[PDB]
Design a protein around this ligand. Sequence first.
Ligand SMILES: O=C(O)C(F)(F)C(F)(F)F
Length: 6
Amino acid sequence: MVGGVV
Ligand SMILES: O=C(O)C(F)(F)C(F)(F)F
């Protein structure tokens, strides 16, 4: 999985 970036 590629985590989101905020
Ligand atoms: O981590 C994932 O979901 C994946 F698709 F396997 C990646 F290719 F990005 F590594």
